[PDB]
Amino acid sequence: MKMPAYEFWFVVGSQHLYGDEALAQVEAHAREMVPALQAAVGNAHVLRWKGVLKDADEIRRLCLEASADDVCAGVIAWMHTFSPAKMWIRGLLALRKPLLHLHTQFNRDIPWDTIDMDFMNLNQSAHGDREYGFIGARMGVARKVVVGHWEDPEVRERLAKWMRTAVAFAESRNLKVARFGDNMREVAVTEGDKVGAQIQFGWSVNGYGIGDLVQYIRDVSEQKVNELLDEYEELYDIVPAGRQEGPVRESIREQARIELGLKAFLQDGNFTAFTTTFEDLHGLKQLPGLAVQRLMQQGYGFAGEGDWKTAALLRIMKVMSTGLQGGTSFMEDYTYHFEKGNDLVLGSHMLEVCPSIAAEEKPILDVQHLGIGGKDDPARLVFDGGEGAAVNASLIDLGHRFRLIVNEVDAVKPEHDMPKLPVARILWKPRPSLRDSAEAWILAGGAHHTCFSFAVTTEQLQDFAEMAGIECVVINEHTSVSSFKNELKWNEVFWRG
Amino acid sequence: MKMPAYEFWFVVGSQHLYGDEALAQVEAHAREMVPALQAAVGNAHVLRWKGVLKDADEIRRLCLEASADDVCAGVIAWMHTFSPAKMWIRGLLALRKPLLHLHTQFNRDIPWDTIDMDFMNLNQSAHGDREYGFIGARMGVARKVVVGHWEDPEVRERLAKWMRTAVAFAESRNLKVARFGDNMREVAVTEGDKVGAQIQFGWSVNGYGIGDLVQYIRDVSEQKVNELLDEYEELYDIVPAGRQEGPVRESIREQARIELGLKAFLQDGNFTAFTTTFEDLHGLKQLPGLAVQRLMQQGYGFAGEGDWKTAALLRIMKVMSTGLQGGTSFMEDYTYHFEKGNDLVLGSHMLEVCPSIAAEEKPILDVQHLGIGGKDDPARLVFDGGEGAAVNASLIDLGHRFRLIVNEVDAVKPEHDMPKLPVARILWKPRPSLRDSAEAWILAGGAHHTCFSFAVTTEQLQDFAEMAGIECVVINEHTSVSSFKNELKWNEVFWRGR
Amino acid sequence: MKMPAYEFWFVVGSQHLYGDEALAQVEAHAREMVPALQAAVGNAHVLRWKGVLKDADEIRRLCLEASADDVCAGVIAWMHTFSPAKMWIRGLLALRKPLLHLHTQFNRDIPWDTIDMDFMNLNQSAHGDREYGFIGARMGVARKVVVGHWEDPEVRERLAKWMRTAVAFAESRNLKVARFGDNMREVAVTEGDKVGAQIQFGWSVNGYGIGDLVQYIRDVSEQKVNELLDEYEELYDIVPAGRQEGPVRESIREQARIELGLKAFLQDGNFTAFTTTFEDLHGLKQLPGLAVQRLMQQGYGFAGEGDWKTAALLRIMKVMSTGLQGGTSFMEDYTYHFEKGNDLVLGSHMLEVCPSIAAEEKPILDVQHLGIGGKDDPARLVFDGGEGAAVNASLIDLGHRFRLIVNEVDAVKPEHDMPKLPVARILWKPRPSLRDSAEAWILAGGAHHTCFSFAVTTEQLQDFAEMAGIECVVINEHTSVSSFKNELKWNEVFWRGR
Ligand SMILES: [Mn+2]
Ligand SMILES: [Mn+2]
Ligand SMILES: [Mn+2]
Ligand code: NA
Ligand code: NA
Ligand code: NA
């Protein structure tokens, strides 16, 4: 997936009171910082220099054009000198893209010997940013605040992380989701108000019949299915039974047909996420398995059993984790392992696990019996899950508002092999332990379908929740369950209304 | 300036159930305690013995008289034996002065040999104060609670500090502020709802024209300024350029004239705080600088750019220290020092920093170029800031309610001197560090004008906020940024319409 | 007075299901309606016909441009056929302009002979707008809803009123107010949160010193002052004492200087409303009187004693009263007349009554001793107020939110003359009576300064409050006071927190 290049407008605030001379000093400092801060991180995204802003009307024009530009994904604001905040009121009302408030100073030390009134009037960010911060508090605007020196490497790393989530938010705003079928019957976590989700996040989620998708698979070029079968054999290890032209190899060709038809449909409608349900497979030979795994590799959002929210959420987590070495997948929490030394959980799905979370071992393509769905034996990629720290998140619908639950876990490498299990799986230790992660997750109402990621941080998800105006609950190393209960109660009283 | 000398009514509660004989022992215990707490680092600070209260009408008469007496600055109540709390209901409704609930005991140990029913009927505060406590919670009255023995130095230290806070609150109740000019143009944090401020704290904030001040400076005694120059030369070190008669010497006498005229005007209207703006000086020669520093040392609250909130807060924070050393000043956060190891902050203003916060060096009188204001080069005191634990306070207006933000800092001594810097300055390390103190302060909506003090504690500011019915957020050594965000949200849910 | 010409984007909605052919009839009907809808009360403002919107991206781009174009002052939307409302969500999210929802039908009768499936697929507005209506309720966006046929005269007349108030709303967002001095001291209703007012309506209210204005009166060319004095003799009826060359004629020249300086400064800062206070007049010869009333006729908003809220309201009511009778003025309720048959009120100010509300008798230029202000005797216009139905409105600050109180009155012609009264005055009968309107007004917290106007209706003010998101209470003929109390109570619980 490629996305429209996004920009970030770097804006400095100032006054006319300190003279026409100081304005040149500010402009010079900013023209010095923006390209050097664009070196940093850097090349992935674009920092554009949008001038010094001194009057209310000038800044109002800026944030109105920012709200009109689809390429602008956020404004970074910094008060170099003292800018009076009432000028920013009329402006902040119109600006809708996310605001980063960069509280920095140009110089790093105070020149104790040669500091005069002119310097004290030029590099006074310490209270100008305080003024701006107050206006941001009194208007109640969603804002990230990053404090430090702009040459300090942690501030640069934080800027990169924020820009990543901001472009993910921009894609979320125009997000299209396609559902083939309906929900698994009587399932509650999968249900939500689509209209409320579009007013909150902007997701347009629409339901198509499965027949339209079968119709799209009818018009796929078979030359392409054989050429794609060649790429499968080059990338994955086909079972010897399926390396020759038997019945098991036609199931792989059938899954290639399904993938190409899904590609055609998703590309025609500008969809970035889709969902399928096993309860509605009238016209397909087999339940889509390998196809959805490859589409997840391509960058598409997916979730099973008709879960449009979790699919959308993984699409957003896919986009906010372009620190190339990602690792992101649809997940379900299947079973526990209660051994006192290493309490761990085995997670997977019926078929649809993305290979982004795999191990250096090349995944193996296999066909095996799947009785859930009542269809033909499906083809799937099988692999063990990698090892490292990760986060698994789920978005749920409380009825009047959304909740984002994120649990930091550590994925561990499997000690033993699992020979009779014919689906890809991953093993992890949740934090702060098994009993406390599970208890806290149940208390928060967490879903069973989860979005697992190696490259999304807790900061990124908290920042997305802040841009979207939704509660974010975090279960990590410091989470006590007794206090987590009261945290939930107080959050519910805050977010009501 | 000085204050109308406030007293504190000490009241002990009991009932008629245990007999008239026990009542005499209770009154005796209280008559023993009151003078001991009236020496005990008390005085100057007068504790009056307001009798034992046993009847509902007796109690309500007391708190009705207390709310009508302007000299009473607070009631301290202690339940010696079990006094039923419904008698206090009608009372607590009428009392409008700060309440300290002293949960104490007369004796220190249990006399294991001679304890009987008669002893258990005298010193049952352990549950009597619980009874009273419930009525304080169920009626929702603002009360401070101090637990311990009345000879414990911790209880005495907290009583003294609380009496300071209560007298500061009493001064806040009748606080008058005079504004010379308007707000600095499009500045938002300096602006606020005056009427909402009178209903919350009682501050009478009124704006006078700047010409009304010039009218007062014409009527100053011309040799009163010469008399003030002698005090200047005795206390401060004038630059040699100003020790004889030249252009530098006229600038010092003009600031002395400004000081004398301001004194006359502020005392004429019983004002205790005032504000000036550099945008409105259409009759003065120079922006008031030396004069403002002298008046802040005299005990007046001041803030620049029309900041009546910061000025009022400075006057009350000056008063809650009354007998300490003691520095307190109006301040603005001017520059950072990002030396990896030395998170440091340089704070000052254009001119108006109080010498109460200075070091031991006697301040220097100077004249230098001030480009903001367009007036004459003004004379001011310059000095380096002292070192010690300190507080940064700011009162802000969220629109429907006020917020008091308090940051604990440690002021450090300047290692190098700043020769070309023509303003007095102070250096501090904020807690828990600079980076996340700034982060949390921006998140909390803190103003740029801050009230700096060496002698005011966080306890005092929390207690003032408790008496005033306003949210108080404290950012100190234990303050984390992640939890600070959600704690702010929960505070907003509690204080929204309270 | 300038006022940038504003346009209104007219948008029709439908879908792609009914074909490229049905879309053509939709577009054809719309280009027939829009120019025909610009005939009717459409000469001040321009109705622009924007594309038919059928997909979410067209709607989003349209509503993004509408909120980005400064010339667009509002969108008029009509669902010709069934447009699914989810496509409209993101657009309504981005739209920051007033929305009028016109629920109409192209044809007026249904052709019983030729009605088939195609007719039911083309003119299904009756349910197409209902879908849209739900989203307007579900997102909680401010909406006017007008139902009827697009050739019906009442819908067109209501469209005119809404377009006037929408242009006034566009002017409110760019409203600048300049204050010469502060509020009248210790006056509470005139005080408010300026920052909250910029967040609610967009008013930028800033205070300049009166010396800044005196400087502008010093730099006015007196040649122009004499040229304006020449206009005075042609328009107004000067007192015999002042038609010759003496001291009484110099007061008119001084007010001409005041007018020229006020104009110069007000246009120098692009201000549209201003306030002056008599408690701060250091540097002016006389309290501004004639000048302020002439500038109020020019289209400026004014209020005395520093009343920026009433000043802004006067400008907004002046702008929505561009059709056209159309008197509008600053007001104060000075005295009652308790004659049990014609209970009426006499209203005016110290000097500052705008001649827009005058009668046809030519106003008289007069000078008399004015002790309020303590300055020289000022020149002023004197006249009696006209007659007709009118509204006097007041905007007040509840601390956490604003309230717009509107009382409909009937202005009466004076029966007796007022020879010794040296101020312009107006007499009116409030509804439903004097003693009942006064009770309702006191309960609603109405100010003493009121904005009185003959040409702005109650609907326009109700709709302005709806566009601004503020409570509007109306006191008219049907107002019972018993139920008026409860309306206030229920409104207070609804309006806390938005
Ligand atoms: Mn399942
Ligand atoms: Mn300042
Ligand atoms: Mn008045
Ligand atoms: Na499609
Ligand atoms: Na006075
Ligand atoms: Na100007």
Side-chain angles (χ1 to χ4, degrees), chain B residues 179 182 186 206 212 282 397 399, chain C residues 179 182 193 204 212 282 399:
Chain B
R179 290 177 71 240
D182 218 322
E186 299 231 69
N206 300 288
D212 291 26
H282 306 88
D397 177 76
Chain C
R179 291 172 70 238
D182 252 338
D193 201 349
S204 187
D212 297 339
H282 299 279

Side-chain angles (χ1 to χ4, degrees), chain A residues 232-348:
Chain A
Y232 296 176
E233 208 143 328
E234 89 160 25
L235 294 176
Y236 319 130
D237 294 336
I238 312 269
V239 280
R243 283 182 175 198
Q244 307 243 340
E245 226 298 329
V248 279
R249 183 186 179 88
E250 244 299 331
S251 294
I252 303 140
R253 198 171 295 107
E254 186 64 28
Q255 199 80 48
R257 209 160 283 105
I258 291 185
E259 173 184 338
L260 291 173
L262 274 178
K263 215 76 162 191
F265 187 92
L266 295 179
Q267 183 103 240
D268 222 298
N270 245 312
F271 297 115
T272 49
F274 75 102
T275 83
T276 84
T277 176
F278 61 89
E279 291 195 341
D280 190 44
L281 294 177
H282 301 241
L284 295 174
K285 207 137 289 187
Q286 57 191 79
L287 168 66
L290 192 183
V292 313
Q293 291 171 294
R294 301 212 74 257
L295 286 183
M296 274 183 287
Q297 273 221 124
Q298 186 69 86
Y300 284 91
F302 170 80
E305 280 95 315
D307 192 330
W308 54 274
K309 51 172 84 67
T310 305
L313 183 275
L314 78 75
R315 173 65 191 159
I316 309 170
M317 287 188 52
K318 232 74 169 285
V319 174
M320 88 179 74
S321 66
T322 313
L324 195 70
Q325 317 315 124
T328 41
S329 179
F330 175 67
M331 272 274 90
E332 208 167 299
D333 318 72
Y334 255 114
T335 172
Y336 298 122
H337 179 90
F338 279 153
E339 266 183 339
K340 176 73 176 58
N342 61 343
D343 274 30
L344 63 86
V345 48
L346 196 162
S348 170

Side-chain angles (χ1 to χ4, degrees), chain A residues 60-61 64 67-68 70 86 89-90 93-94 96 138 173-174 193 196 198 202 204-205, chain C residues 60 64 67-68 70 86 89-90 93-94 96 138 173-174 176 193 195-196 198-199 205:
Chain A
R60 171 195 183 271
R61 278 277 87 187
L64 256 179
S67 298
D70 287 353
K86 273 183 57 157
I89 297 183
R90 232 206 308 169
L93 286 174
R96 47 208 304 96
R138 203 216 172 290
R173 279 182 155 192
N174 294 305
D193 206 356
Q198 193 150 18
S204 93
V205 174
Chain C
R60 203 183 73 95
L64 223 57
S67 44
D70 287 296
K86 280 178 59 175
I89 299 182
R90 299 194 216 166
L93 286 176
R96 223 189 109 189
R138 173 82 159 74
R173 302 198 309 177
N174 305 308
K176 269 147 190 54
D193 201 349
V195 174
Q198 194 148 330
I199 286 173
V205 169

Side-chain angles (χ1 to χ4, degrees), chain A residues 429-495:
Chain A
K429 331 280 201 202
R431 306 222 277 262
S433 63
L434 201 52
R435 264 138 287 278
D436 298 352
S437 81
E439 196 166 338
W441 190 276
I442 294 180
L443 289 171
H448 67 294
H449 288 122
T450 166
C451 183
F452 179 89
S453 177
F454 284 108
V456 178
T457 37
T458 295
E459 194 186 14
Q460 284 191 282
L461 284 165
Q462 277 166 203
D463 284 347
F464 184 84
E466 273 256 13
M467 302 178 193
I470 69 182
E471 170 193 9
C472 181
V473 287
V474 175
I475 302 166
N476 59 15
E477 43 266 13
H478 311 290
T479 288
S480 168
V481 162
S482 62
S483 195
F484 183 85
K485 266 286 305 171
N486 292 318
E487 183 192 293
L488 267 39
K489 294 180 188 270
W490 299 327
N491 270 34
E492 232 292 325
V493 83
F494 166 71
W495 284 104

Side-chain angles (χ1 to χ4, degrees), chain A residues 127-384:
Chain A
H127 64 253
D129 280 316
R130 260 168 182 82
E131 157 84 356
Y132 185 99
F134 159 86
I135 207 55
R138 203 216 172 290
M139 300 196 38
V141 64
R143 46 169 180 150
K144 176 77 167 173
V145 190
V146 286
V147 173
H149 193 250
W150 64 280
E151 285 173 7
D152 168 33
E154 60 179 312
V155 155
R156 311 173 172 268
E157 284 279 286
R158 269 175 91 91
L159 269 196
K161 279 193 253 262
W162 179 82
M163 281 174 195
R164 211 164 308 282
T165 89
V167 311
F169 186 73
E171 213 79 353
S172 169
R173 279 182 155 192
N174 294 305
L175 185 92
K176 303 288 299 314
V177 185
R179 295 193 314 160
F180 298 98
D182 214 329
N183 296 250
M184 188 185 155
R185 284 171 213 105
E186 299 273 67
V187 175
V189 300
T190 310
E191 201 63 77
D193 206 356
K194 324 272 181 314
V195 179
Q198 193 150 18
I199 85 167
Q200 186 74 277
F201 310 113
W203 309 344
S204 93
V205 174
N206 309 113
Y208 293 76
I210 200 71
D212 306 340
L213 197 278
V214 174
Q215 171 238 321
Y216 265 57
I217 315 186
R218 295 200 209 107
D219 306 338
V220 66
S221 155
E222 55 272 77
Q223 150 161 302
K224 290 169 202 286
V225 316
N226 306 323
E227 297 183 303
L228 189 64
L229 189 50
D230 272 85
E231 212 180 336
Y232 296 176
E233 208 143 328
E234 89 160 25
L235 294 176
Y236 319 130
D237 294 336
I238 312 269
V239 280
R243 283 182 175 198
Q244 307 243 340
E245 226 298 329
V248 279
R249 183 186 179 88
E250 244 299 331
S251 294
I252 303 140
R253 198 171 295 107
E254 186 64 28
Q255 199 80 48
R257 209 160 283 105
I258 291 185
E259 173 184 338
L260 291 173
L262 274 178
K263 215 76 162 191
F265 187 92
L266 295 179
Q267 183 103 240
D268 222 298
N270 245 312
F271 297 115
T272 49
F274 75 102
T275 83
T276 84
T277 176
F278 61 89
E279 291 195 341
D280 190 44
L281 294 177
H282 301 241
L284 295 174
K285 207 137 289 187
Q286 57 191 79
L287 168 66
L290 192 183
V292 313
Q293 291 171 294
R294 301 212 74 257
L295 286 183
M296 274 183 287
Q297 273 221 124
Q298 186 69 86
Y300 284 91
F302 170 80
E305 280 95 315
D307 192 330
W308 54 274
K309 51 172 84 67
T310 305
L313 183 275
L314 78 75
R315 173 65 191 159
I316 309 170
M317 287 188 52
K318 232 74 169 285
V319 174
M320 88 179 74
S321 66
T322 313
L324 195 70
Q325 317 315 124
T328 41
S329 179
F330 175 67
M331 272 274 90
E332 208 167 299
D333 318 72
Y334 255 114
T335 172
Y336 298 122
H337 179 90
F338 279 153
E339 266 183 339
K340 176 73 176 58
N342 61 343
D343 274 30
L344 63 86
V345 48
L346 196 162
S348 170
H349 205 243
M350 73 187 38
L351 306 173
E352 34 254 50
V353 165
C354 170
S356 197
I357 67 174
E360 174 217 3
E361 289 85 31
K362 287 69 211 169
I364 176 164
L365 181 277
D366 166 60
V367 62
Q368 196 113 340
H369 178 260
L370 177 67
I372 285 72
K375 270 37 217 173
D376 193 11
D377 290 358
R380 56 170 144 292
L381 280 165
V382 193
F383 49 83
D384 227 310

Side-chain angles (χ1 to χ4, degrees), chain B residues 467-485:
Chain B
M467 307 179 192
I470 87 175
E471 171 200 342
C472 180
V473 53
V474 171
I475 180 172
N476 56 15
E477 324 90 39
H478 330 292
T479 289
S480 168
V481 153
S482 187
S483 319
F484 184 93
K485 204 173 305 304

